[model samples]
Target: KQLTKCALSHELNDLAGYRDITLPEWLCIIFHISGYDTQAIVKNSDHKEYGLFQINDKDFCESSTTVQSRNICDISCDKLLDDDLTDDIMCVKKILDIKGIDYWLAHKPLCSDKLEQWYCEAQ
Candidate 1:
């Protein structure tokens, strides 16, 4: 599901506030990762990234194809691709705590600078 930037920011603002992350930075990262699409999935040669936050199957989620998955999030990769974000948000929290923001890879090159572009602008 494609989310409006306003809706995405409102949700992330509350979620990110509980973590050490800032709203603007989190928004920036999400934009680069999945463009606010709840069902977005990116398939790489070695692994797949799922959901709005793009949790990876190799390290965070388990699926039939990811036989060697660490399953740190204890969730199926299929679940992360759904419209409901409860599981996806929980997984993101774990990833942020364990792997830090660098897990997204897009943070350093893209989201780290000029983050104001992603700040919520709609009511």
Candidate 2:
């Protein structure tokens, strides 16, 4: 998929190098977060989560009208819902930079035990 290819590219390679993490681990984290649901949106009382990684409207991205966000990614939430995943990947990198792998709570519990599956050779 687009995300996998992007991770394999030079621009994102160093992201995995940090803290000895690998592309598979990062992919696993994304799998746990969005499962490739590009248009995914979840509503909560405080805010709405948007797109593949579920970037929050409360502070991370700009949702549609009236949902003023802090714009951490400096992008509109709608951009994340598109088929192109470049924006989402960039935003995710920002998040990883700000917070370590632990930022995705599911990383440890969900992805830690079964990383091989995430990196298995594609058929």
Best by TM-score: 1
- In candidate 1, clashing pairs total 0
**Looking at candidate 2, what is the lDDT of residue 42?**
79
CA lDDT of every candidate: 0.80, 0.69
Give the runs in model 1 whose Cα sits over 4 Å from its true position: none
lDDT of 1 by residue, 2-121 (tens): 987778777665476645677887787788789888888888988888889888888999976836899999999889877778888888889878987778764457766777776777
lDDT of 2 by residue, 9-53 (tens): 333454566656676776676666766567778797989888767
Off by over 4 Å in 2: 1-20, 106-108, 120-123
